[PDB]
Design an enzyme around this catalytic site. Structure first.
Site, PDB file in Angstrom:
ATOM      1  N   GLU A   1     -18.267   1.342  28.320  1.00 49.12           N
ATOM      2  CA  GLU A   1     -16.899   0.922  28.006  1.00 49.12           C
ATOM      3  C   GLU A   1     -15.937   1.262  29.143  1.00 49.12           C
ATOM      4  OE1 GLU A   1     -16.112   1.115  23.259  1.00 49.12           O
ATOM      5  OE2 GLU A   1     -17.735   2.320  24.108  1.00 49.12           O
ATOM      6  N   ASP A   2     -16.327   0.869  30.354  1.00 44.87           N
ATOM      7  CA  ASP A   2     -15.576   0.916  31.609  1.00 44.87           C
ATOM      8  C   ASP A   2     -15.525   2.299  32.247  1.00 44.87           C
ATOM      9  OD1 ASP A   2     -15.005  -1.795  31.673  1.00 44.87           O
ATOM     10  OD2 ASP A   2     -13.143  -1.551  30.534  1.00 44.87           O
ATOM     11  N   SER A   3     -16.227   3.293  31.720  1.00 47.05           N
ATOM     12  CA  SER A   3     -16.341   4.557  32.427  1.00 47.05           C
ATOM     13  C   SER A   3     -17.252   4.388  33.638  1.00 47.05           C
ATOM     14  CB  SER A   3     -16.868   5.644  31.498  1.00 47.05           C
ATOM     15  OG  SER A   3     -16.086   5.755  30.325  1.00 47.05           O
TER      16      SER A   3
END
Lengths: 46, 35, 343, 43, 271, 116, 253, 70, 210, 257
Positions: free
Chosen positions: C52-54
């Site tokens: 989730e975009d980490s």
């Protein structure tokens, strides 16, 4: 404080055994240097 | 005038803690006035 | 940037011109003042800390100076002249004849009332000493004593800012009043919670950092400076990210700037051909081993350089907590503002 | 102590002297770094 | 010769690189050996700086960070002590090294400040340690900063002893290659293809050291990983053979610490 | 800033035991042993060596969170055989193997230097 | 380290004898003679302790007490060997002069003790004080002496005094003391407790966290005080008088 | 900004080679790839370090920390 | 008068203790209960000190000798106890002591923390004690904060006639195990005044110094 | 209106945390407090906490008496001096397994404000399980969320018995689950259960250890000879409780699919 009849029989057998051991160890020391440190993994065959 | 009711020392020694909104005696640590 | 005393300034230690440049950049001068660095990126799933975009980052890379930025801040002050008498003076205050002193350490101030360059200031310290004369008829409702002939008007540092004073400047304004400007320096290092972005609308935050031992490696001993998740490619259809990766890899292996301008003749198959001349799998895949156990990985991994920019949002500037504190004069409710420790 | 802004001339100024350079006469004056290096611990 | 133990075949060596095969060994052992070779071998590096004069165009922690990564000779690092153990206040003579740096830009043309200008002023007590590592032809080594007319830099450096598990500056190995099973006999990796997987994937240099599999042979479901091909390169501080030997020694000491703690706990249980 | 000190990875705090042994309540002859300030480098080696003993039934390890340097090992052996004895045998075998490896590497390096 | 719960008072010597009898009527025990010698030491002013955290006040400088027992052969003059060694000898100890002089005490140079100001608040019925204690058994070296030891730590001598009195042991660990105090200087010896005896009744608690025991101790002390109503008034001393920090100087005597 | 001393990825040292690398580009009139490989830079991460470096230290050096305008 | 000596080996191995235990097994008569020891160093935090005044203070805690602490500074010793059974009865009786004291280490590290601060700590636990013919030998592994430090040997005898011969014999026994760098000490703090535990602590300090 | 005892910070993902547990940074845990009441069951731990002081976690920051007076532990040297009684209050730091309320703005529906159990961690971010990011409509590219601390026993019970994350799985807007396996765990749980996937011995041992609810029994393999192997379905069945039955027939599937 013993709990089992087999435990009691083993206790008496050990009593006789180490009483004899103490008697003979005293006999040796009153005349001999024993060793109380050595423990062998396997008992020596008779 | 604001004095500690336990140290009873004159002149009183007082430090204001702005980031906590408190007025604190610098000897016994007692909090005198809040907010 | 060395002279200018701007309110805020950020500088990057080592900037790198991109490996894939459009032809138009030669007019914006983006190869003279870049804004990012070429980071080796491996698109993969690895331990589940980049979802989730980490993203996951190599800690040895951080330690060697990747994405490290200088920070510069400034303050100003001047003597005010109320009526005909000078109502403000630059002098080190003394507790004998002053009231409403601040809890900050006045010790670092010189005799002039101005701190000197090269002193590690910290939270709530003072750097300018300002004293206000007060008329005898003015009494603070019994607070003032006989010898308190002046009031304190010093300027403490912002509660969180730390660092080293870098410059001090003394001048005069149009009215001939004295004028002081102080510039302070600090260093910022990436950490869990920062913000990074590629040139194709793909931005994220650092979620964990690993050391070179836990990083998956190739047979040649190369290690990814960062690892992103592949669940970000399909719904965004950023094929240009993949093409930029491939072309930058080919340019790094070859040693010449690779054109990426729009509406031109470069194709994917051509650069794949130029890639296989060097000895790598044509679609950019590679064989990589697990960092912990040392085994082989069942699936191959897309691997290569890219360009990333360090955005302006740091977690150190967003973190805030409050148990109690100052109230408001009228409504008597916790004040507004993070720098004023509000609710 | 202080220092000029154009020629960086070495000057000493009192608490009442005019804030000017003697040789160039400019109105911009810079400080001088602490001559005695002071050790610190970052906490 | 020890025929009951791990076997080794060195094929290539130099001042920096060692290239070899490790056979008759588990995979866990080789992996642990490489992890220790990268992470847990002590070395000597600059750990503190204090500056007197700075009239350059760079910052102070900038130059400090640049200095903290310069490599220095650390052959006899076994005779220093961790500064957290030495009874001295601050830095010892037995638990630190001290250098000084001074430079001034007298000439009109800009003058480079390299790492050949670090001068050691402490007492070494006859130990081979502290010398800067120089690997270029001209002998200048790591360039540190740049000076103009009328600019000076003066500072003092304290270098200490540590490992790479706390900063990347103490690491003595650059990058180590670790390969095995180039024919995929064990079926550990599964290839990705468009038309023919056997052609798209290039061949490793190591294929010459094993015999290709035959299509008539059924999949051997009893083999295990036994032969590994490694290559190790050093930053320069430690000789590479010493890197390997010290990695083995450190692994031995860790296992021996485990053994000693276990024996202590067994004695405690006896009580 | 909330970044913990790095030296907490290799220096035990005061009052810290490098090993902690706890009997497992589910399977007979099973122990859970916690190691402190250690990572996969040691656990993988010890488990791979403990898998070679024909009297060892179960041997598995884990590192619950990558923030803290510590890991758990679990051992289960046959009746009439102590897991601590198994750990001791594994450590002895590992030490002997490493010694043989070091001797072999030194011999090969010296031979290469003669051939250098 | 103990929590000492104490009550204080004083009496004139005229009733002294009578008081003694009454105590034996209650406790059922006879008094036992005792003596002691205390030396007070303070941090050296020559050394600047910048380590006192001025911005936080983590700690403040304090004074150390060293106590020792002295045999009665130093306190009995040539006129007093005829009488037996019992409590009645205190009846002759009314003069400011005493056989033990400055030179003998200087020739002497144990139990080391530190204390804190009693607990604040006005809801306390007995003086509760915290004491940290240790014991010095022996020593050796080229300068083995109490003075050299305390100078090695960083402390210097301030004054000293001598206590002589009687002790009563009652139930529940309650100890009652009747004291006479003689300050000693090269200038001479002066009895501060002139024409009277200082009375102190106290109990010790080993652990401050246990509160059932503390409540029991307070109950016993208040019962003892309520037993002696009409004869002697036992009172809580001033909290600001039992403060022994260096910054502020006063001494309950 | 002066050349990084070490490589951010493989730990190698490239700081000292910048001066000699600049020599091959105009004294020997070689191309960039062969010049990069002439100095033992074989992993493409070291080539990345040397190849894409913007040397900003020669601009600050013609300048003083005193009196920039706007 | 009993005599004692202390030998410290710095380059020892983890298994050296077992090697020396077995190499002496022929003469070993008996074995007794294990022992422990603590070794702290405290530093002076004040800067206005004279040149001739030392800065350190070594505290040695003996666990088997009835829980006793010894403070050492400039060849000056001080012995403190903390057990209620070691208190001279006079101090209990007269009121000079509350009866339940504290160790001096708590006093140094709690109340005087603005004059003295801790700098290191070296510990030794689960040592072994062996009775040989007219001799008692104690062995233990020393652990610092970082890890294993070295081997410690302490010898105590009642008859002082042939102490040197026994020391030479033990040195030779270490010699066959190829432990060649060992520092020994049997000095006495005071030639005229002989206190056993103070001399033992001084010998420990002289052996353990760097 | 603005409030006290609250914090605000960016979020991140942690796959090792349980579903209803949140990672709280160290400093934010050192700033907020809780007024615990001194009783016979806690006076030892509370005494040690007061001795610790305000510069150490765990610790305390204020002590309130019975009369309402409040002593600042920082200035009062009496961290090692104050003796506690029954009914006093220690304002201690927030400790593991303390309930908190946690939300993201805008709070459009009921499921955007939920309770959590704290775990004190280093660094500056909050931590969440990767399955609660759906009810919050939140990702990890810069989102900040808000933390509110209860200050009583009734309030703590309300946060623990009403607003807890476990109780908010079947949403009442559309009577179906609002959480599930998402993103890469979902991409993996499918590659695991193909008929193609077989597992050797060592990995099965490690996997069975990882399941914290294991009972020490090793499943008998599915291919005993000529080599013991395990199928992914077999290892994954260990996580699933016992007594769960499920039937689903897709298009063109028979009783032997």
């Amino acid at each position: 404080r013993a709990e089992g009849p087999e435990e009691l029989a083993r206790i008496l057998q050990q009593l006789k055994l180490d009483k004899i051991i103490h008697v003979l160890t005293t006999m040796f020391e009153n005349t001999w240097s024993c060793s109380r440190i050595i423990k062998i993994d396997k008992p020596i065959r008779t | 005038v604001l004095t500690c009711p336990e140290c009873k020392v004159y002149p009183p020694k007082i430090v204001e803690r702005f980031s906590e909104g408190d007025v604190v005696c610098a000897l016994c640590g007692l909090v005198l006035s809040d907010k | 940037y060395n002279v200018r005393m701007d309110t805020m300034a950020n500088i990057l230690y080592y900037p790198q011109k991109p490996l894939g440049t459009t032809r138009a950049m030669e007019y914006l001068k983006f190869r003279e003042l870049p804004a990012g660095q070429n980071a080796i990126v491996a698109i993969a799933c690895y331990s589940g800390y980049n979802q989730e975009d980490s993203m996951i980052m190599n800690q040895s890379s951080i330690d060697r100076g990747l994405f490290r930025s200088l920070f510069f801040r400034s303050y100003m002050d001047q003597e005010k002249k109320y009526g005909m008498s000078i109502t403000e003076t630059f002098e080190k205050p003394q507790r004998t004849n002053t009231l409403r002193m601040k809890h900050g350490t006045y010790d670092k101030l010189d005799d002039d009332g101005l701190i000197a360059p090269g002193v590690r200031v910290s939270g709530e310290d003072v750097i300018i000493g300002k004293t206000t004369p007060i008329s005898p008829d003015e009494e603070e409702l019994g607070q003032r004593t006989a010898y308190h002939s002046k009031r304190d008007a010093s300027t403490p540092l912002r509660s969180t800012e730390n660092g080293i004073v870098d410059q001090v400047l003394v001048t005069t304004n149009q009215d001939g009043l004295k004028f002081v400007k102080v510039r302070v320096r600090t260093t910022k290092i990436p950490q869990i919670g920062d913000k990074f972005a590629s040139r194709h609308g793909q931005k994220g935050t650092i979620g964990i950092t690993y050391r070179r031992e836990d990083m998956p490696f190739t047979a040649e001993g190369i290690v990814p400076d960062l690892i992103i998740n592949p669940h970000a490619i399909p719904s965004r259809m950023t094929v240009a990210h993949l093409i930029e990766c491939l072309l930058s890899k080919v340019a790094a292996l070859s040693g010449n700037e690779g054109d990426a301008s729009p509406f031109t003749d470069i194709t994917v198959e051509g650069i794949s051909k130029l890639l296989r001349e060097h000895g790598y799998q044509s679609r950019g895949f590679e064989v990589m081993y697990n960092g912990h156990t040392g085994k082989k990985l069942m699936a191959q991994i897309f691997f290569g350089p890219t360009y990333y920019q360090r955005l302006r949002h740091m977690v150190d500037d967003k973190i805030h907590a409050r148990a109690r504190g100052p109230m408001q004069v009228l409504t008597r409710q916790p004040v507004e503002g993070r720098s004023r420790d509000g609710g | 102590k202080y220092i000029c802004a154009e020629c960086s001339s070495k000057l000493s100024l009192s608490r009442t002297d005019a804030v000017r350079c003697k040789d160039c006469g400019h109105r911009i004056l810079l400080k001088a770094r602490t001559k005695r290096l002071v050790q610190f611990e970052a906490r | 010769m020890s025929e009951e133990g791990p076997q080794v075949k060195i094929r290539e060596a130099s001042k920096d690189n060692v290239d070899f095969i490790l056979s008759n060994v588990d995979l866990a052992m080789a992996n642990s050996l490489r992890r220790v070779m990268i992470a847990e071998i002590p070395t000597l590096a600059i750990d503190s700086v204090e500056v007197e004069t700075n009239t350059t165009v760079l910052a102070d922690e900038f130059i400090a960070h640049r200095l903290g990564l310069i490599p220095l000779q650390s052959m006899d690092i076994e005779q220093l002590e961790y500064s957290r153990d030495c009874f001295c206040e601050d830095h010892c003579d037995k638990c630190s090294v001290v250098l000084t740096l001074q430079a001034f830009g007298e000439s009109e043309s800009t003058t480079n400040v390299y790492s050949k200008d670090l001068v050691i002023v402490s007492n070494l007590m006859g130990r081979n340690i502290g010398h800067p590592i120089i690997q270029d032809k001209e002998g200048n080594g790591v360039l540190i900063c740049k000076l103009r007319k009328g600019q000076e830099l003066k500072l003092t450096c304290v270098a200490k002893k540590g490992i790479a598990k706390e900063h990347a500056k103490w690491g003595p190995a650059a990058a180590i290659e670790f390969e095995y099973d180039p024919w995929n006999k064990l079926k550990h990796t599964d290839y990705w293809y468009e038309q023919d997987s056997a052609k798209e994937w290039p061949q490793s240099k190591n294929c010459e050291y094993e015999d290709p599999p035959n299509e008539g042979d059924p999949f051997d479901y009893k083999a295990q990983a036994d032969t590994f091909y490694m290559n190790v390169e050093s930053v320069g501080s430690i000789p590479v053979d010493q890197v390997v030997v010290r990695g083995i020694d450190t692994l031995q000491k860790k296992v021996a610490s485990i053994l000693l703690a276990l024996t202590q706990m067994d004695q405690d249980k006896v009580n | 800033m909330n970044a913990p000190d790095r030296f907490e990875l290799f220096l035990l705090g005061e009052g810290e035991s490098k090993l902690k042994i706890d009997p497992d309540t589910k399977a007979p002859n099973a122990v859970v042993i916690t190691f402190e300030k250690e990572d996969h480098t040691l656990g993988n080696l010890i488990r791979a060596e403990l898998l070679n003993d024909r009297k060892v039934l179960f041997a598995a390890y884990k590192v619950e969170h990558p923030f803290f340097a510590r890991f758990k090992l679990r051992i289960q052996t046959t009746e009439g055989y102590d897991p601590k004895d198994a750990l001791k045998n594994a450590c002895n075998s590992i030490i002997n193997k490493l010694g043989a490896l070091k001797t072999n590497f030194e011999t090969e390096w010296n031979l290469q230097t003669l051939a250098a | 380290m103990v929590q000492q719960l104490s009550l204080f008072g004083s009496i004139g010597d005229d009733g002294y004898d009578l008081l003694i009898s009454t105590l034996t009527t209650i406790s059922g025990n006879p008094p036992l003679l005792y003596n002691s010698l205390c030396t007070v030491w303070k941090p050296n002013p020559s050394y600047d302790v910048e380590n006192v955290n001025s911005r936080n006040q983590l700690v403040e400088p304090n004074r150390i007490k060293l106590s020792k027992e002295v045999p009665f052969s130093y306190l009995i003059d040539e006129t007093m060997m005829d009488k037996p060694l019992n409590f009645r000898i205190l009846k002759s100890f009314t003069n400011d002069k005493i056989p033990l002089n400055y030179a003998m005490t200087r020739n002497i140079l144990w139990s080391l003790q530190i204390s804190d100001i009693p607990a604040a608040g006005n809801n306390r019925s007995v003086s509760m004080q915290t004491i940290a204690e240790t014991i010095i058994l022996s020593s050796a070296g080229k300068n083995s002496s109490v003075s050299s030891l305390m100078n090695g730590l960083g402390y210097v001598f301030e004054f000293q005094y001598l206590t002589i009195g009687v002790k009563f042991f009652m139930k529940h660990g309650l100890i009652l003391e009747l004291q006479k105090i003689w300050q000693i200087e090269e200038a001479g010896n002066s009895q501060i407790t002139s024409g009277g005896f200082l009375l102190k009744a106290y109990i010790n608690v080993s652990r401050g966290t246990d509160i059932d025991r503390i409540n029991y101790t307070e109950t016993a002390l208040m019962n003892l005080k309520k037993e002696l109503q009409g004869y002697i008034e036992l009172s809580v001393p001033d909290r600001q008088s039992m403060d022994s920090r260096v910054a502020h100087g006063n001494i309950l005597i | 900004m002066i050349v990084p001393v070490r490589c951010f990825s493989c730990g190698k040292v490239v700081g000292d080679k910048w001066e000699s690398y600049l020599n091959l580009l105009q004294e020997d009139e070689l191309d960039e790839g062969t010049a990069l490989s002439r100095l033992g830079l074989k992993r493409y991460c070291c080539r990345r370090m040397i190849l894409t470096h913007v040397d900003l230290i020669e601009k600050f050096l013609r300048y003083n920390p005193l009196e920039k305008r706007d | 008068m009993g005599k004692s000596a202390v030998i410290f080996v710095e380059r020892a191995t983890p298994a050296t203790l077992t090697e020396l235990k077995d190499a002496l097994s022929n003469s070993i008569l008996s074995v007794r209960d294990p022992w422990s020891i603590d070794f702290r160093t405290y530093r002076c935090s004040i800067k206005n000190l004279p040149a001739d005044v030392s800065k350190l203070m070594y505290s040695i805690t003996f666990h088997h000798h009835g829980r006793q602490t010894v403070l050492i500074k400039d060849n000056s010793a001080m012995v403190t106890t903390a057990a209620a059974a070691d208190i001279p009865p006079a101090l209990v009786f007269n009121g000079s002591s509350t009866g339940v004291p504290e160790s001096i280490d708590t006093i140094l590290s709690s109340k005087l923390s603005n004059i003295w601060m801790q700098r290191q700590l070296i510990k030794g636990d689960a040592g072994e004690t062996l009775i040989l013919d007219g001799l008692t030998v104690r062995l233990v592994n020393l652990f610092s904060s970082t890890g294993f430090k070295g081997l410690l040997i302490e010898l105590q005898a009642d008859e002082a006639g042939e102490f040197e011969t026994k020391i030479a014999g033990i040195e030779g026994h270490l010699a066959e195990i190829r432990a060649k760098e060992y520092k020994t000490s049997s000095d006495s703090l005071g030639p005229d005044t002989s206190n056993e535990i103070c001399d033992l602590a001084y010998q420990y300090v002289r052996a353990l110094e760097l | 209106k603005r409030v006290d005892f609250s914090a605000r910070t960016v979020i991140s993902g942690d796959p090792n945390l349980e579903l209803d547990q949140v990672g709280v940074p160290k400093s934010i845990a050192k700033t907020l407090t809780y007024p615990e009441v001194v009783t016979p069951y806690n006076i030892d731990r509370l005494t040690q906490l007061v001795r610790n002081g305000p510069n150490e976690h765990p610790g305390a920051k204020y002590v309130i008496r019975d009369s309402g007076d409040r002593i600042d532990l920082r200035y009062s040297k009496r961290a090692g001096d104050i003796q506690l009684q029954y009914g006093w209050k220690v304002e201690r730091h927030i400790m593991d397994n303390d309930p908190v309320l946690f939300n993201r703005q805008p709070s459009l529906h009921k499921m955007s404000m939920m309770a959590h159990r704290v775990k004190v961690i280093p660094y500056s971010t909050f931590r969440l399980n990767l399955s609660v990011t759906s009810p919050y409509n939140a990702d990890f590219d810069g989102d900040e969320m808000n933390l509110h601390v209860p200050q009583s026993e009734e309030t703590r019970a309300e946060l623990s018995q009403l607003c807890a994350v476990p109780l908010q799985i079947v949403s009442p807007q559309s009577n179906k689950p609002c959480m599930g396996i998402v993103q890469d765990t979902l991409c993996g749980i499918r590659k695991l259960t193909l008929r193609d996937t077989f597992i050797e011995l060592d990995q099965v041992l490690n996997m069975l250890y990882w399941v914290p609810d294991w009972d020490g029994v090793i499943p008998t393999p599915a291919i005993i000879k000529p080599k013991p192997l395990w199928s992914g379905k077999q290892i994954l069945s260990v996580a699933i409780p016992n007594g769960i039955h499920l039937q689903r027939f897709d298009e063109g599937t028979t009783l032997l699919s």
